Amino acid sequence: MGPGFDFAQAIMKKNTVIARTEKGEFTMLGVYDRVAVIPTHASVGEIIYINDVETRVLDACALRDLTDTNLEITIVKLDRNQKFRDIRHFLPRCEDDYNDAVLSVHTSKFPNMYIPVGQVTNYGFLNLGGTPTHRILMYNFPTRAGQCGGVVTTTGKVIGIHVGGNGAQGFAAMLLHSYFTD
Numbered sequence: 572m573g574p575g576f577d578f579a580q581a582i583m584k585k586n587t588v589i590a591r592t593e594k595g596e597f598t599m600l601g602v603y604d605r606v607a608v609i610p611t612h613a614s615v616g617e618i619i620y621i622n623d624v625e626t627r628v629l630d631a632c633a634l635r636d637l638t639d640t641n642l643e644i645t646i647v648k649l650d651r652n653q654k655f656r657d658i659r660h661f662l663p664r665c666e667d668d669y670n671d672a673v674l675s676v677h678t679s680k681f682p683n684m685y686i687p688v689g690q691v692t693n694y695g696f697l698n699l700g701g702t703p704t705h706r707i708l709m710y711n712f713p714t715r716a717g718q719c720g721g722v723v724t725t726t727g728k729v730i731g732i733h734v735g736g737n738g739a740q741g742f743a744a745m746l747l748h749s750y751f752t753d
């Protein structure tokens with residue numbers, strides 16, 4: 572509907588797959604080469620389904636900060652025959668607040684879904700499902716069970732992936748450029 576939705580759509584159309592684990596279907600953001608991200612609560616194993624194709628996981632790393640606190644991001648390398656468009660230059664370098672973000676989801680349950688979530692706060696610490704978690708972004712939209720792993724964007728930046736909510740607010744784990752240096 573506007574330039575925010577334009578940038579979000581450009582990311583969804585080229586840099587997302589539908590990931591299925593034993594814990595459900597997730598929006599999964601491809602970042603570069605065969606490297607993607609997913610919420611750590613997806614519990615990625617040795618095999619994952621990518622757009623309903625059985626795919627070997629070559630590596631999976633649940634990220635933690637240097638205080639050894641959960642970040643809720645898992646970086647996955649997929650045994651896929653095709654690379655993602657490299658979008659690392661759209662990743663922020665530092666922790667920040669944002670105006671006018673869009674949360675975008677693509678699953679069997681929620682195809683082609685885009686939500687204008689508005690102002691995004693650098694919230695920081697959250698007890699997420701009982702797990703102390705750092706680098707959380709917060710937005711005032713009643714997000715539902717199923718939007719997790721969804722890409723949070725502003726115009727020109729991919730800033731996070733949806734990892735939870737409390738019925739009134741939604742919470743995203745930051746993406747930082749430094750996570751994807753090769």
Ligand SMILES: NC(=O)c1ccc2[nH]ccc2c1
Pocket residue numbers: 713714715
């Ligand atoms: N995520 C939501 O809060 C939300 C609101 C209205 C809806 N109607 C169809 C799906 C849906 C999701």
Ligand SMILES: NC(=O)c1ccc2[nH]ccc2c1
Pocket residue numbers: 714715716717718719720734735736737738
């Ligand atoms: N609170 C929520 O809306 C919530 C909780 C757990 C979830 N797992 C993946 C999506 C998601 C959303």
